[PDB]
Amino acid sequence: IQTQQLHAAMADTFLEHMCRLDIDSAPITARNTGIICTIGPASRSVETLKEMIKSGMNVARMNFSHGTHEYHAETIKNVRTATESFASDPILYRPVAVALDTKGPEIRTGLIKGSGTAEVELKKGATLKITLDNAYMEKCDENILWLDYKNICKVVDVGSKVYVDDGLISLQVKQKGPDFLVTEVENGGFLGSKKGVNLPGAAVDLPAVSEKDIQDLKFGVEQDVDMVFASFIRKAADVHEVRKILGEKGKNIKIISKIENHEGVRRFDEILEASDGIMVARGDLGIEIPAEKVFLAQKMIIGRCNRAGKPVICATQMLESMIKKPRPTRAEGSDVANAVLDGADCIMLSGETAKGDYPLEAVRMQHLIAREAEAAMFHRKLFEELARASSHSTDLMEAMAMGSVEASYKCLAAALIVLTESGRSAHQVARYRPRAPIIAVTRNHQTARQAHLYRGIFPVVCKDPVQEAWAEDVDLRVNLAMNVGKARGFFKKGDVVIVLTGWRPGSGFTNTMRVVPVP
Amino acid sequence: IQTQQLHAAMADTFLEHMCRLDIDSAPITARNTGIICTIGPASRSVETLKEMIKSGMNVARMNFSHGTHEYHAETIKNVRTATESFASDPILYRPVAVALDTKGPEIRTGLIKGSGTAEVELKKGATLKITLDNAYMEKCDENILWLDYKNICKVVDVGSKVYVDDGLISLQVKQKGPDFLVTEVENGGFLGSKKGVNLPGAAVDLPAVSEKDIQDLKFGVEQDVDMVFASFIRKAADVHEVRKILGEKGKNIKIISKIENHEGVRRFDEILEASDGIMVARGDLGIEIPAEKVFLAQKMIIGRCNRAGKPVICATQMLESMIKKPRPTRAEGSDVANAVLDGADCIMLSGETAKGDYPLEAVRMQHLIAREAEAAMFHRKLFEELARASSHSTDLMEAMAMGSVEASYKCLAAALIVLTESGRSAHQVARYRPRAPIIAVTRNHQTARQAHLYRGIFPVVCKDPVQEAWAEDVDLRVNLAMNVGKARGFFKKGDVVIVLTGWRPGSGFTNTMRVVPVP
Amino acid sequence: FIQTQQLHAAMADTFLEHMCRLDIDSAPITARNTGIICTIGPASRSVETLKEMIKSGMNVARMNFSHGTHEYHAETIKNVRTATESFASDPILYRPVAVALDTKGPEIRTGLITAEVELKKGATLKITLDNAYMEKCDENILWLDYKNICKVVDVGSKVYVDDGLISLQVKQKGPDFLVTEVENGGFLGSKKGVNLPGAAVDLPAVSEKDIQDLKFGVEQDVDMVFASFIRKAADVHEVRKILGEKGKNIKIISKIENHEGVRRFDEILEASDGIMVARGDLGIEIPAEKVFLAQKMIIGRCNRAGKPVICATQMLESMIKKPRPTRAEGSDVANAVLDGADCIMLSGETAKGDYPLEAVRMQHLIAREAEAAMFHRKLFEELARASSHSTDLMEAMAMGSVEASYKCLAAALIVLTESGRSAHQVARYRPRAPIIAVTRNHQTARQAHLYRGIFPVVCKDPVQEAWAEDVDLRVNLAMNVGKARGFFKKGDVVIVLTGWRPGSGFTNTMRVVPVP
Ligand SMILES: [K+]
Ligand SMILES: [K+]
Ligand SMILES: [K+]
Ligand SMILES: [K+]
Ligand SMILES: [K+]
Ligand SMILES: [K+]
Ligand SMILES: [Mg+2]
Ligand SMILES: [Mg+2]
Ligand SMILES: [Mg+2]
C-alpha cells in the first residue's frame, strides 16, 4: 500500500482521485498546516504552554477583546518562557509566533441586575426595550437591556434584526425613536452579562481602529509581536489605518485581516491587496450572513488567497465540542480536514485552548487531521491550476519556485531546503504547494516566527556566526537543515532533497536550485 | 449577479470555480439532497411529524437499537397519518419513506446499580473487571462491568483496547479468564447504563443478522417499509443474508449497507456490488478506525457510489450541537455542505431529531445548507468525470440519461421530467448529476417513496387510470409534472424542460427525449 | 502590439482555442529547433555547394548507400568535412555538421525478361524459384531471388512488384513456386523490387553489402547509421554487432519500413538509439492512406521515450523540378514538426534535384513557424504524465528547468555536458527556447542534432584547473554564441544547467541567469 495517498495522486480525474483515497495509506511525519492556539486561563501557565508546543502549536493568539495589558504581558512572557525552555537543543528548537487579535468595533450588553452570575430568560414573542441610558448599564434584565453602541438608533430601522450572545438570541425592532428601541424576541434564550451584539445588514459606524485598539496596537509593538489579527476589516482603508498605527517601528509586523461581515466579503479583493494575510473569521461571519452561506465565503476566500500566495487562516469552532469532551464530533473532524483540502495555510483554535477542559487533546487532534488531509490533496491538479492563475507573471523567483516544486514532484523529494533572510523565496515555494516540507533556514528570528503563516514552511533558526566565504556559509546552513530533517525523521541518508540557495551573497533571491542526496 | 453559482459554473479550473463562489448568488427553490430523520420521543407525535414534513423530511428512520415492535409500529403509524394528512391537495402532497435501521451485532454494557439512569466515575489508572456472569448484568459499578458479548474472551488478547460509550472511555485488558477480563482504565469518564462497546482490531464473531435482527426484518416486511439500513455490514455475504431474510415478500425493499468498521471499508467494493445503497455510518466508523481518517473513507465511499450510480447517505453528528442549541456550529455547517459537495445523495439526522430540543430547526438547517451546496457543485467537471468513469458501458438508458443531462446543461432547463414505474430511468438520470430537479412521475407508490434515496428526484404519484391510447397516457403524466412543477415553483410558463418518455407501452426504458416549453 | 512566437495561442485553455488563436502576424524567433537532414549527392556534393547548404541550415549530411561506390561516398564525406571546417576559423559561429550512413538493406528482386512484358488483370502468373528461369522471365513465369518466399506467404497473400506498381494474389502454393492472379497489371521490367505486405520476411538484418558498408562507415568515423528495413529488436542488435568496439558510440537509427516493423515497434524502439519513419517504403508496404497513422503513432511513442525520431521522404518532392513547393508539401513539413519530429529529412530534393538550397531554406522557414505553433503547456503536461512512473533525478532537473523556462520566458537553456545526456533529457521535455549544449566532445556535438532544440557548441579551450572557472568559461562561451546568433541579448534571462562538481555525473545545478 503506497504511503501518503500516492496511488490517489496518480489519478486522471478528481473523481478517480477521491475513489482512491485509502485509510491504510500512512501519512508522512511532517505536518504542513500551521496551528494557531488562543491562549487563556486553560493554557497560559508555563507548564501547559510547554505541552502546547510539544503537541504542535505554532502561533499563540492573544485575544484583546478581554484582558488588561498586564494580563497579556504575563501570558506573552509565559509563551516565550515555554518556547525558550527548548533552545537548549538548537536542532530541535521550534520557534513560536505571537499574534495580537484586536477587539475592533464590538457591541456588547451591560451587566444583568443582581450579583454577577445572574441570567434572565428572553421569551419568544415577549418584548424587550434596548436603551442607551448609562443609568441601566448594570441593571439589565428581561425588560430593559443596555448596550454600549450609542449610535445604534441611527443605523437600524423598524424590522431590523438584532442578534445577541453569539447569535443565539434574535430580536426584531418594532418601534424606534432616539435613545431607545422596542424589540420583540423572535428566538429566545437565557441572557447573561456583557454579551456580544450583531446588527446584520446595518451599516455600523464605529471606527475600524478605536482609541482602545490604538493603545493595544502600540502595546503590541512594544511587546515585539509577530502579527496582528485585525477584527472586522471592511475595506482596504481599514487595513491602511492599522498599518499607520503600527508605524515605522512596527512596519515588519504582518497584518492579517479578519473577514467577518458582508461588506468584508464584498470588498474582499481590495482588502487582500492591502493585507499580508487573511483570516476567515467564521464566528461573526456566520451571524452577519446566513450561516448556510459561510462555506461559500470560506472557499472563495481561501482560493483567492492561494491564488495570490498570501496566507489564509480558517478560524472558529473547528473542534468546538472538545471544550467539554476529549474527542471531537464527526462534523468537527470533517471540518478540519476540508479546511486543509480547501487550501488553508493555518487552522485555529479559540475556546478549545483558551478555556476548554482539553486544550492539549484539541491541539493534537488538529495535528493528526491536518497530516491526513495534506496527503489527500490532489497536488498535480492544484499545481497546474495555480500555475494557470499566475501565468501573467514572469517573476524570476516564481519561476525558481515552480521549477523546484515540479522537480520535487518528479523525484518524490523528501523536502525542499530554502535559505532566506526575509523569507520571500520560501513563501514563493509554499505558494505552489509542494507535497514535501519546506525547511527554511534563516538567521532572522522574526522571519522564522512569521513563516508559520505559510503552508509547509518549517522554519529553522541559524545561530552560527557568518562564515568568511559565501560557499561555506551556504553549506553550513544547508547542512543545518539536513541535520534538522534527520532528527525529526523527515528523511534519512540516501533520500533526495531539493535545495534552493543564492549563487552569491548579492543574489536577491534563491536563484540556484539543486537536487541533492541526503548525506 | 447570476443565480445558482452559474458564474462559478463557467470556470475553466477547480480553483477558478472556488474563487467565483458568491454568497450573493441565489440558489434555486428545489433542494435535490434527501433528508433522513431519525424519529424518537422528540419527533414522534403526529403534530410534530407534520411539521417535520413541512420542514423537509423525506425519510423517517426507525432505529431498532431500541424500542419494542409495538413502539415502532405506533411510530410508523404516526408517520403515515402525518404524511397522508396532506393527500387532500394532490399537487402539493409529498411521499415520505419509512426506513428500518437494524440493531446488528452490537455490544452493550449492563445496568449501573440496577438503574437505567445511574452513573459511576471511572478514574484514569483504576482497575475495572469485565464479567459475562449474568448475575452482574444489573449490578455494574466502578469496580465491575458486565457486557453482553458472550465470546469476548475468545476474540481479545492481553493488551487489547476496549472502548465504551461512543468511544469516550477506554480500557486496556491486563488479564483474561474463562468469563471475565481484568482491565485498566486508560481514558476515564462517567459511565452510564447499557452503553455501546467497540473492540477495534478484533475478530468479532457476532452474526451480521442475529435472531433479533431476523425478527425485526420480518416485522419490517409486515409493516411495508421502503428500505433497510443494515448495521455493521462487513462483507457481501452479510448483504446476501439480509436479502435472504427479506425473502420474496420483501424483494422490492432496498438494502442500504452501513459501513462502520475497518473490514467494511476494506471490502467496500464487494459490499457495494451486493447492496442497493450505502450509508457512511461515521459514529461507529470513527471509533473503529482513527477519527482523523474518517473523511478519507467518506470521500472514497461517496465517490465510488457516485461512480456506480448507487445511493449513498452521509450520517451521524452532522448537526450534533443542535441537540441542545437552536443553531449549529460553523464546523457543522461546513460538514453538511461538504457532504453535499462530495456527492452524497442524502444526509441524515439522528439525535438531532430523535431526542433533541430543536428537531424542526435541525431539519430546516439541513434543507438550507443543501440548497446552497448543490448550486456550488462544479457540474461540468463532475459530468465529464462521471462519464469517463463509466465509459466502458454502452447501456442504452445511460446514453439517454447522459444526453438528457447534457441537453439540460446546454439550454439551462428548469427540470427534467421522467416517466417511470420502477424508477430505473429516473435513477440513471440522477446518476449523471443534472443541476435541475428530476420530476419522476410514477403510478407505483413504493417507487415514489424509494426515489428519495437518489439525488434530485422529486417523486410524483399519478393516481389517474391508464389511458387506453399510449400517447394520451404519456401526455396526462407529463402534464401532471408540469402542474406540480408550477405549483411548487420549480418553473413557470415559457421555461424549458427535458422530458424523458417511452415511445411505446412495451419500451423497457425512456428511449424518447424532448425539449419542451412549460405551458 | 501582437505577441511574437504564437504566445497568445500559447495561453489558450483548449486545443481548439489554441488553434483559433494561431496568427500569421505573430513573428517566430530566430532559432530553429528541428534538425534538417540533407541527402548529399550529385546535385549537392561540391565543396562550394556544401558551404551554402550549411549556411542555409543543413545539420546532418546523409549518404545513401543504395547507390555509389565507397570511393564515391568517401569523396562526398571529405567534401562535407572540408566545407564544415571552412567555418572553424571562428569558434563563435562554427556549426557542427554530422555525417550519417543510410544502408541499402536486404532486398528481393526479380530476374530478367532491357525487355518489358505486360501483365493484365485477372491473368495467371507463376512465381518460381527455379534458377533455370532466372534470366527467362516472361508473361507466364517470374523468377525472384528470395528462396524462402513460400515459408512466409499464404494463399490469399499479396506480392507487390516494382515499388507497388504490380500486385499479385497467391492462389496456389507449391513447395518452390506460387501461382498468382495479377490484380494490378502493368508493364514488368527486369530486376525489379518485390514487397510482401504483411509478411514476416526472414531476410537477414544486414546483407553482405551492408556489412561492408557499415565497416566502411566505422572507418569513415560517421556519427550515425540509418538501418534499413528493421523488423525486430534482433535486427538492431545485429547492426550494433557489426559496428563493433570501434563504432560503439555510433548511434543506430532504425528505419520503420513495413508492417512487421510497425507492429513490433515497441521492441525496436527500446533497442534503438532513434527511429526514422521511412514513409516511401512504408507507403509501398502498407496502404498509402494509413501512413499518417504510423507516422503519428511512432512520433508520439518516440517523444514519450525521449528518443530521436526523423520524418523522411517526399516532404518537398516537387522542388526536385520546381523552385517552390506545393501547398501540400508546406503543410506536410509543418505537421511533422507539430507531430513532434526531432528532425526532418530531404532525399532527392537535395541529392539530385535542381533546387537543393531552395529546399533546405524552405524547411528552415516552415519549421520555425511550426515550432512556435506547438501547444507547449499541454505537450509538457502530457509528457510529464506519460513518464511519471520514472523518478529519475536528471528528468526531475530537466522538468524543473523546462518549467522554469516557461514561467519566466527564458531566451534559452544552457547545458554543459560531455555525453550529451543532460541536454537530451531537457530536449525530451520540449522547451520553447533553444538549448545551447556546450561540450568538449566533438562527437556529442555532431550527434546532438538528432534532438529537437539542441544547438551544439564545441568548446576548444583547455580545462581550467579550478572547476568554477571551467564552468564560467563554458557558460560564457554559450552566452557569446547566443548573442552572436541573435538568440538573446544583454538583459534577457537564461536557464543554466551545470554539474556541482567535476564528478556530479549529470547537471544537478540549475540557475536563472541574466544575459551579461
Ligand atoms: K478579538
Ligand atoms: K529570499
Ligand atoms: K441501529
Ligand atoms: K423505467
Ligand atoms: K538506403
Ligand atoms: K551530462
Ligand atoms: Mg469575531
Ligand atoms: Mg453505528
Ligand atoms: Mg526499403
PDB file of C-alpha atoms in Angstrom, chain B residues 67-217:
ATOM      1  CA  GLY B  67     -37.742   0.045  21.392  1.00  0.00           C
ATOM      2  CA  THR B  68     -40.250  -2.769  21.015  1.00  0.00           C
ATOM      3  CA  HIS B  69     -42.168  -3.685  17.880  1.00  0.00           C
ATOM      4  CA  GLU B  70     -45.292  -2.138  19.437  1.00  0.00           C
ATOM      5  CA  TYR B  71     -43.404   1.134  19.906  1.00  0.00           C
ATOM      6  CA  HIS B  72     -42.050   1.290  16.351  1.00  0.00           C
ATOM      7  CA  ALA B  73     -45.385   0.162  14.900  1.00  0.00           C
ATOM      8  CA  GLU B  74     -47.012   3.209  16.503  1.00  0.00           C
ATOM      9  CA  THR B  75     -44.225   5.467  15.243  1.00  0.00           C
ATOM     10  CA  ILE B  76     -44.724   4.155  11.693  1.00  0.00           C
ATOM     11  CA  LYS B  77     -48.474   4.639  12.035  1.00  0.00           C
ATOM     12  CA  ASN B  78     -47.990   8.255  13.089  1.00  0.00           C
ATOM     13  CA  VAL B  79     -45.572   8.921  10.221  1.00  0.00           C
ATOM     14  CA  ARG B  80     -48.236   7.692   7.803  1.00  0.00           C
ATOM     15  CA  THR B  81     -51.062   9.608   9.498  1.00  0.00           C
ATOM     16  CA  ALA B  82     -48.917  12.751   9.225  1.00  0.00           C
ATOM     17  CA  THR B  83     -47.914  12.015   5.636  1.00  0.00           C
ATOM     18  CA  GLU B  84     -51.469  11.362   4.437  1.00  0.00           C
ATOM     19  CA  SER B  85     -52.808  14.476   6.173  1.00  0.00           C
ATOM     20  CA  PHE B  86     -51.555  16.284   3.027  1.00  0.00           C
ATOM     21  CA  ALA B  87     -53.170  13.961   0.477  1.00  0.00           C
ATOM     22  CA  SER B  88     -56.184  16.308   0.314  1.00  0.00           C
ATOM     23  CA  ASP B  89     -54.195  18.539  -2.087  1.00  0.00           C
ATOM     24  CA  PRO B  90     -52.574  16.071  -4.532  1.00  0.00           C
ATOM     25  CA  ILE B  91     -50.471  18.720  -6.280  1.00  0.00           C
ATOM     26  CA  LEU B  92     -48.518  19.541  -3.098  1.00  0.00           C
ATOM     27  CA  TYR B  93     -48.523  16.097  -1.438  1.00  0.00           C
ATOM     28  CA  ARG B  94     -45.076  14.675  -0.718  1.00  0.00           C
ATOM     29  CA  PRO B  95     -44.296  10.947  -0.364  1.00  0.00           C
ATOM     30  CA  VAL B  96     -42.457  10.090   2.847  1.00  0.00           C
ATOM     31  CA  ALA B  97     -40.452   6.869   3.047  1.00  0.00           C
ATOM     32  CA  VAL B  98     -40.009   4.634   6.095  1.00  0.00           C
ATOM     33  CA  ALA B  99     -36.604   3.071   6.808  1.00  0.00           C
ATOM     34  CA  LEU B 100     -35.677   0.334   9.295  1.00  0.00           C
ATOM     35  CA  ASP B 101     -32.220   0.627  10.883  1.00  0.00           C
ATOM     36  CA  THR B 102     -31.237  -2.761  12.347  1.00  0.00           C
ATOM     37  CA  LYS B 103     -29.536  -3.208  15.692  1.00  0.00           C
ATOM     38  CA  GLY B 104     -26.946  -5.537  14.181  1.00  0.00           C
ATOM     39  CA  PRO B 105     -24.030  -7.050  16.099  1.00  0.00           C
ATOM     40  CA  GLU B 106     -23.981  -4.506  18.921  1.00  0.00           C
ATOM     41  CA  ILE B 107     -22.134  -4.913  22.218  1.00  0.00           C
ATOM     42  CA  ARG B 108     -23.690  -3.253  25.262  1.00  0.00           C
ATOM     43  CA  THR B 109     -22.959  -2.974  28.972  1.00  0.00           C
ATOM     44  CA  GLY B 110     -25.468  -3.773  31.720  1.00  0.00           C
ATOM     45  CA  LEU B 111     -27.259  -1.620  34.299  1.00  0.00           C
ATOM     46  CA  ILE B 112     -25.398   0.601  36.759  1.00  0.00           C
ATOM     47  CA  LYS B 113     -26.635  -0.314  40.243  1.00  0.00           C
ATOM     48  CA  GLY B 114     -29.849  -1.768  38.786  1.00  0.00           C
ATOM     49  CA  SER B 115     -30.831   1.654  37.431  1.00  0.00           C
ATOM     50  CA  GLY B 116     -31.323   2.950  33.910  1.00  0.00           C
ATOM     51  CA  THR B 117     -30.212   6.440  34.913  1.00  0.00           C
ATOM     52  CA  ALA B 118     -27.383   5.883  37.429  1.00  0.00           C
ATOM     53  CA  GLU B 119     -23.736   6.655  36.637  1.00  0.00           C
ATOM     54  CA  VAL B 120     -20.338   5.925  38.181  1.00  0.00           C
ATOM     55  CA  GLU B 121     -16.987   7.661  37.610  1.00  0.00           C
ATOM     56  CA  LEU B 122     -14.098   5.664  36.078  1.00  0.00           C
ATOM     57  CA  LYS B 123     -10.802   7.356  37.020  1.00  0.00           C
ATOM     58  CA  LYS B 124      -7.666   7.024  34.889  1.00  0.00           C
ATOM     59  CA  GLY B 125      -5.485   4.156  36.063  1.00  0.00           C
ATOM     60  CA  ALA B 126      -8.159   2.416  38.119  1.00  0.00           C
ATOM     61  CA  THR B 127      -8.856  -1.278  37.795  1.00  0.00           C
ATOM     62  CA  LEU B 128     -12.085  -2.488  36.219  1.00  0.00           C
ATOM     63  CA  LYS B 129     -13.216  -6.074  35.699  1.00  0.00           C
ATOM     64  CA  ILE B 130     -15.439  -7.089  32.777  1.00  0.00           C
ATOM     65  CA  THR B 131     -17.634 -10.096  33.547  1.00  0.00           C
ATOM     66  CA  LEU B 132     -20.022 -12.149  31.437  1.00  0.00           C
ATOM     67  CA  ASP B 133     -21.701 -13.652  34.540  1.00  0.00           C
ATOM     68  CA  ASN B 134     -25.367 -12.706  34.071  1.00  0.00           C
ATOM     69  CA  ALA B 135     -25.583 -12.313  37.862  1.00  0.00           C
ATOM     70  CA  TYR B 136     -23.975  -8.894  37.334  1.00  0.00           C
ATOM     71  CA  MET B 137     -25.861  -7.679  34.257  1.00  0.00           C
ATOM     72  CA  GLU B 138     -27.836  -5.326  36.521  1.00  0.00           C
ATOM     73  CA  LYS B 139     -25.035  -4.783  39.058  1.00  0.00           C
ATOM     74  CA  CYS B 140     -22.415  -2.710  37.263  1.00  0.00           C
ATOM     75  CA  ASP B 141     -20.395  -0.210  39.303  1.00  0.00           C
ATOM     76  CA  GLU B 142     -16.948   1.384  39.229  1.00  0.00           C
ATOM     77  CA  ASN B 143     -15.323  -1.971  40.051  1.00  0.00           C
ATOM     78  CA  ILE B 144     -17.230  -4.478  37.928  1.00  0.00           C
ATOM     79  CA  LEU B 145     -18.801  -4.075  34.488  1.00  0.00           C
ATOM     80  CA  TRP B 146     -20.951  -6.606  32.646  1.00  0.00           C
ATOM     81  CA  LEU B 147     -21.366  -6.750  28.865  1.00  0.00           C
ATOM     82  CA  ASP B 148     -23.374  -8.988  26.571  1.00  0.00           C
ATOM     83  CA  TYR B 149     -20.747 -10.295  24.101  1.00  0.00           C
ATOM     84  CA  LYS B 150     -20.506 -13.894  25.308  1.00  0.00           C
ATOM     85  CA  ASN B 151     -17.438 -14.757  23.188  1.00  0.00           C
ATOM     86  CA  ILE B 152     -15.495 -11.592  24.026  1.00  0.00           C
ATOM     87  CA  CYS B 153     -12.809 -13.601  25.815  1.00  0.00           C
ATOM     88  CA  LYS B 154     -12.140 -15.594  22.632  1.00  0.00           C
ATOM     89  CA  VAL B 155     -11.549 -12.578  20.370  1.00  0.00           C
ATOM     90  CA  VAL B 156      -9.482 -10.252  22.575  1.00  0.00           C
ATOM     91  CA  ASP B 157      -5.934 -10.532  23.868  1.00  0.00           C
ATOM     92  CA  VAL B 158      -3.994  -9.093  26.771  1.00  0.00           C
ATOM     93  CA  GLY B 159      -3.118  -5.548  25.736  1.00  0.00           C
ATOM     94  CA  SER B 160      -6.233  -5.150  23.569  1.00  0.00           C
ATOM     95  CA  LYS B 161      -8.022  -1.816  23.989  1.00  0.00           C
ATOM     96  CA  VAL B 162     -11.732  -1.627  24.872  1.00  0.00           C
ATOM     97  CA  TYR B 163     -13.909   1.422  24.148  1.00  0.00           C
ATOM     98  CA  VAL B 164     -17.126   2.310  25.982  1.00  0.00           C
ATOM     99  CA  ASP B 165     -19.949   4.832  25.451  1.00  0.00           C
ATOM    100  CA  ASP B 166     -19.410   6.178  21.934  1.00  0.00           C
ATOM    101  CA  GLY B 167     -15.678   5.687  22.399  1.00  0.00           C
ATOM    102  CA  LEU B 168     -15.468   8.295  25.167  1.00  0.00           C
ATOM    103  CA  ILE B 169     -13.993   5.829  27.710  1.00  0.00           C
ATOM    104  CA  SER B 170     -11.141   3.407  27.036  1.00  0.00           C
ATOM    105  CA  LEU B 171      -9.829   0.336  28.849  1.00  0.00           C
ATOM    106  CA  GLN B 172      -6.838  -1.942  28.250  1.00  0.00           C
ATOM    107  CA  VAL B 173      -7.061  -5.651  29.023  1.00  0.00           C
ATOM    108  CA  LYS B 174      -4.473  -6.871  31.540  1.00  0.00           C
ATOM    109  CA  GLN B 175      -5.631 -10.442  32.228  1.00  0.00           C
ATOM    110  CA  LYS B 176      -8.020 -12.929  30.639  1.00  0.00           C
ATOM    111  CA  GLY B 177     -10.256 -15.525  32.266  1.00  0.00           C
ATOM    112  CA  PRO B 178     -12.923 -18.058  31.284  1.00  0.00           C
ATOM    113  CA  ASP B 179     -15.728 -15.482  31.643  1.00  0.00           C
ATOM    114  CA  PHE B 180     -14.050 -12.241  32.706  1.00  0.00           C
ATOM    115  CA  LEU B 181     -11.393  -9.719  31.720  1.00  0.00           C
ATOM    116  CA  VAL B 182      -9.384  -7.604  34.144  1.00  0.00           C
ATOM    117  CA  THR B 183      -8.623  -4.200  32.642  1.00  0.00           C
ATOM    118  CA  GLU B 184      -7.180  -0.798  33.465  1.00  0.00           C
ATOM    119  CA  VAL B 185      -8.949   2.493  32.795  1.00  0.00           C
ATOM    120  CA  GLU B 186      -6.964   4.487  30.215  1.00  0.00           C
ATOM    121  CA  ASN B 187      -9.394   7.288  29.279  1.00  0.00           C
ATOM    122  CA  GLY B 188     -11.721   7.804  32.234  1.00  0.00           C
ATOM    123  CA  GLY B 189     -15.174   9.313  32.435  1.00  0.00           C
ATOM    124  CA  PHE B 190     -18.696   8.930  33.749  1.00  0.00           C
ATOM    125  CA  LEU B 191     -20.213   5.584  32.746  1.00  0.00           C
ATOM    126  CA  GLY B 192     -23.971   5.058  32.468  1.00  0.00           C
ATOM    127  CA  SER B 193     -26.176   2.047  31.783  1.00  0.00           C
ATOM    128  CA  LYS B 194     -26.445  -0.062  28.612  1.00  0.00           C
ATOM    129  CA  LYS B 195     -23.683   1.742  26.721  1.00  0.00           C
ATOM    130  CA  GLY B 196     -22.086   0.677  23.461  1.00  0.00           C
ATOM    131  CA  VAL B 197     -18.754  -1.156  23.405  1.00  0.00           C
ATOM    132  CA  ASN B 198     -16.282  -1.082  20.500  1.00  0.00           C
ATOM    133  CA  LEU B 199     -13.360  -3.502  20.019  1.00  0.00           C
ATOM    134  CA  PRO B 200     -11.166  -2.031  17.265  1.00  0.00           C
ATOM    135  CA  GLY B 201      -8.903  -4.593  15.677  1.00  0.00           C
ATOM    136  CA  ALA B 202     -10.686  -7.665  16.991  1.00  0.00           C
ATOM    137  CA  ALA B 203     -12.192 -10.566  15.051  1.00  0.00           C
ATOM    138  CA  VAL B 204     -15.689 -10.046  16.405  1.00  0.00           C
ATOM    139  CA  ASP B 205     -17.615 -13.199  15.520  1.00  0.00           C
ATOM    140  CA  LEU B 206     -21.151 -11.951  16.159  1.00  0.00           C
ATOM    141  CA  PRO B 207     -23.607 -12.752  13.345  1.00  0.00           C
ATOM    142  CA  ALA B 208     -24.322  -9.939  10.912  1.00  0.00           C
ATOM    143  CA  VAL B 209     -28.024 -10.826  11.136  1.00  0.00           C
ATOM    144  CA  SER B 210     -28.905 -12.071  14.625  1.00  0.00           C
ATOM    145  CA  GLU B 211     -32.028 -13.804  15.849  1.00  0.00           C
ATOM    146  CA  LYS B 212     -33.295 -10.385  16.980  1.00  0.00           C
ATOM    147  CA  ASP B 213     -32.438  -8.886  13.577  1.00  0.00           C
ATOM    148  CA  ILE B 214     -34.424 -11.625  11.815  1.00  0.00           C
ATOM    149  CA  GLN B 215     -37.458 -10.759  13.939  1.00  0.00           C
ATOM    150  CA  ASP B 216     -37.051  -7.051  13.163  1.00  0.00           C
ATOM    151  CA  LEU B 217     -36.543  -7.626   9.430  1.00  0.00           C
TER     152      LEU B 217
END
